[PDB]
Amino acid sequence: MWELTILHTNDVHSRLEQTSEDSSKCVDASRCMGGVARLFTKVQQIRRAEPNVLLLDAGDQYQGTIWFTVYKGAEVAHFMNALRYDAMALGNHEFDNGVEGLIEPLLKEAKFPILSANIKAKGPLASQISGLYLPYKVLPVGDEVVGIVGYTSKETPFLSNPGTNLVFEDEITALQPEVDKLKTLNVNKIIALGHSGFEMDKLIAQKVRGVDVVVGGHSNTFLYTGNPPSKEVPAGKYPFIVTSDDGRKVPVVQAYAFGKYLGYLKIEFDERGNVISSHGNPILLDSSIPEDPSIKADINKWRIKLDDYSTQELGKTIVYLDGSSQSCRFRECNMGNLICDAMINNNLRWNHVSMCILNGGGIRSPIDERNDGTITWENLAAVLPFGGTFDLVQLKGSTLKKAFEHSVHRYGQSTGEFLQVGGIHVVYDLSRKPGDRVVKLDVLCTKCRVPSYDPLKMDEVYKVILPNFLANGGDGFQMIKDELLRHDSGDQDINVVSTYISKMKVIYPAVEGRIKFSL
Amino acid sequence: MWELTILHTNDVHSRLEQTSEDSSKCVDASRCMGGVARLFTKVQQIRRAEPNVLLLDAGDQYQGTIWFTVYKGAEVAHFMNALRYDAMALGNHEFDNGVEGLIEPLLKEAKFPILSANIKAKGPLASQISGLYLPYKVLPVGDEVVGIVGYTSKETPFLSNPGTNLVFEDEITALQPEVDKLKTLNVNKIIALGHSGFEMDKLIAQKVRGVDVVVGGHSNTFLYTGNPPSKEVPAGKYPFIVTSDDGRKVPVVQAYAFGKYLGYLKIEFDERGNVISSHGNPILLDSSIPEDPSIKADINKWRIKLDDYSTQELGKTIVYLDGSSQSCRFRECNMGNLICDAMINNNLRWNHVSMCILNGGGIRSPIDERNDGTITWENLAAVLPFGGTFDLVQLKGSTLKKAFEHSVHRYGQSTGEFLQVGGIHVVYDLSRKPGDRVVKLDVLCTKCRVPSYDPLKMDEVYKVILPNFLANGGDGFQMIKDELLRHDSGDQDINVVSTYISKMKVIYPAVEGRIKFSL
Ligand SMILES: NNc1nc(N)c2ncn([C@@H]3O[C@H](COP(=O)(O)CP(=O)(O)O)[C@@H](O)[C@H]3O)c2n1
Ligand SMILES: NNc1nc(N)c2ncn([C@@H]3O[C@H](COP(=O)(O)CP(=O)(O)O)[C@@H](O)[C@H]3O)c2n1
Ligand SMILES: [Ca+2]
Ligand SMILES: [Ca+2]
Ligand SMILES: [Zn+2]
Ligand SMILES: [Zn+2]
Ligand SMILES: [Zn+2]
Ligand SMILES: [Zn+2]
């Protein structure tokens, strides 16, 4: 029998340095986690112990901290080469700086295959990008050969900036002919490595004949067998077993996000490449694992240029700024209220925009207050990494009512469309059918001398400050894009929040009942 | 028969210049009201028409605008002498700058008798103040004589700063022997002129034998017969008829506040000084009455020194700052929220005071936004004229619960104890018995990383920022004074709100459900 050890990361999102338990900037070094130096140490311990090891990445290395803001993907190629990744699948955030932002710093510099079977290039781009990413790779592992086939979310055009020249096909339709090709070349051990979310990973495991293992990302899924080591609640056992249509038990794995864990799956194969069994668990990369000094020294060398974004203190917080997805995609989070209050305050400088809506998935990180409360550009850069704008927009009450129904239409799945608000008091009843969950919606009046809250009226018009991402129909808010009456472009997102914090000096945004649930 | 015309003012509170309909600074001159130049014109028109006229003041000329801040009562003696007041009764605000603040600028400079029968001086003060105010005066009016007897609120020691050396006796007990003295001197026409509120004015009319008329103040009572000319809703007919214990019909009058109206009561007496009948109404001092140019010119001469408090713009408001008593003593008013937000913001500069309570009677004026939104020291001086401080205090939840029960214990009478809040969400049910009207009370947690609202606990302790007036048991909040665990003195009230506004630049405080009523 032949044993393979798959080590996998996903949704690392520029967490090159070690971080806090909430994946924000490391303050108390004794309880810090993750980061590529610590990962390098654990990978090395496994490569010493196990003869057949593959180190895989399921996408979204791009976007998340000042590392990516400054180095634009060169830190990813440099530190993934130093860690000796065997393969990587393209994620949606790999296209955030267009195709050239992917081609030049990463595709042309990676010393490992970068994969995606369902991305087809067309027109002039097709010639330049040929061979820079591959539909699959066959990798020698000891005396055997392992096929790895890539896949990328079909939603990348709606989430990122891949351009017109790239077509994202259905993953199952694009994967089957590649897996069939590998089987004709007698590759009997096949890993599907990709970035489409756990639900799609489960469908690929079921529908794509010949796939032995699925290693995914995108949904930040935490899977565990037994008692979990930190705050992440497991969504299922590790590995997650799917029984395929042809009757094979297919393990599906994912390792949360931000380099906090290293996925570890041991697979026992027979001579014909059949999975006899498999077992493992994500390894928490906590303080007990030492950071490799060679990688840490090289990180400290690259950190010098980034220290210009931490020397200038913008303001000070006396509260934890909860920008976690567990809060911001499920309920009112004070990071949401802060950003919506900065949005309204920057604009109100004799203009009358009283209302704000902000997608929870746009808040990419919390900020900690225990470093004497100090907030820097570096801290803000991880909360608002996209370089978007906060736009003024004019909407009918009916349109706003539909947006709030979309905010909770499939609540409970940690999706980014949950809205954080300002100048709005919304009440939900999740017991009701999707599309009819908003039980109360009051808005701060504008055509009144003393502003107060009153029921929203379907026939009335309202001025709303919101990200350009929402104004352009992002996160399924097509009603905002289709039904809006006016859309003006506003100032840069990070500059708006920064200018607000420096004026306030000390901030203490609270959760105050802007969003409520009715039992 | 002999006819007397009584013209009366009360609670003018330094409104020497004409003002807006809400009694705040005049912006649109074409719709402005009151002010002493306009009053002088209407008084003159009546003195030309009627041979027997008395111009009376029932107290509280002191405190209210930059006029009093700067001239400290010299403007009151100067402009009351110029208007030719026949008599004035002492109010509680006449003692705001102590006994010397009353003696020197007003008592020693008034060319008319100043009255109070129930104020008895003791110790060294008794010698200095002898003859400076009188228990009564007998005034010649044509061929007849009219006795005027003064009275001042027994609550002046709890509201103002009269010192230890002055005793405020029960008005009824002090008035009867003075009215009896006037009757032995054969003065058959007696006016009780004083400053104790409409309820006490009604009791004096009933219980003090020999009083023909009561002219009051303090409660800002608006009385009218017929269709009223402005926003003030009448509390009864003008005059208000009380039937005394000895069976006489006694008219009781009051003329709202701030010099917006001139009280006008015509009384028909027989030869034995019996009131045969009476009639009249408060005259609205609106734009249609011209300001007397001699008084206006003299006001413009005195206004030069006060223009140093209007040249410096503190900030800008884009909302009406509702500091009216009709809002601030009955429900959440945004002037209250603004002041409580300045109170918390000034203090939070690693201190953790999340809560604020502010008596509604401490907000002495609104601010208008139609002068391009500009806010000046002059505008703030009329909102916060006392020169008090916003103190930090430590209270048991039980104590805070009792203070909120006191806030609405006799709701509906426009009393100053209604509390404006910050970092507190209170719900009242007025249907319940007094002392049991608070149905919900949530407070912003402090021993938590993310502040949120949670039910107040009786056994827990809380840090609260509030005026020194409240910390010292003012407005019947004896439980705060008796039961507090710690009381530190804070910064000056007006400087705290000013420093806040200049930092914010544009303010837009809203009514947001901090205070609610349950049906
Ligand atoms: N607010 N701007 C904004 N701009 C973008 N370019 C953008 N791309 C993704 N998002 C948000 O991020 C959410 C997806 O986050 P995750 O579930 O963690 C998958 P991801 O790692 O972003 O590919 C979406 O639901 C959106 O709310 C984005 N939000
Ligand atoms: N907040 N400070 C403060 N300091 C003072 N020195 C003071 N004196 C009076 N008040 C408030 O003013 C209210 C009385 O106002 P009115 O009913 O208009 C009678 P007034 O003209 O003040 O004598 C009281 O209930 C208090 O709330 C006062 N409030
Ligand atoms: Ca196989
Ligand atoms: Ca009489
Ligand atoms: Zn991701
Ligand atoms: Zn993704
Ligand atoms: Zn008064
Ligand atoms: Zn008074």
Swiss-Prot record, chains A, B:
Alphabetized PANTHER family for the sequence: 5'-NUCLEOTIDASE (PTHR11575:SF24), 5'-NUCLEOTIDASE-RELATED (PTHR11575)
Assembly description: Homodimer.
Places the protein is found: Cell membrane
Primary enzyme class: hydrolase
BP GO annotations: adenosine biosynthetic process; ADP catabolic process; AMP catabolic process; ATP metabolic process; calcium ion homeostasis; DNA metabolic process; inhibition of non-skeletal tissue mineralization; leukocyte cell-cell adhesion
Residues annotated as binding AMP: 329, 359, 364, 386, 469, 475
The UniProt record lists the keyword Nuclease: no
Protein known as: 5'-nucleotidase
Family, per entry: Belongs to the 5'-nucleotidase family.
Carbohydrate-modified residues: 28, 286, 308, 372
Residues where IMP binds: 329, 359, 364, 386, 469, 475
Catalysis performed (reactions): a ribonucleoside 5'-phosphate + H2O = a ribonucleoside + phosphate; a 2'-deoxyribonucleoside 5'-phosphate + H2O = a 2'-deoxyribonucleoside + phosphate; dTMP + H2O = thymidine + phosphate; CMP + H2O = cytidine + phosphate
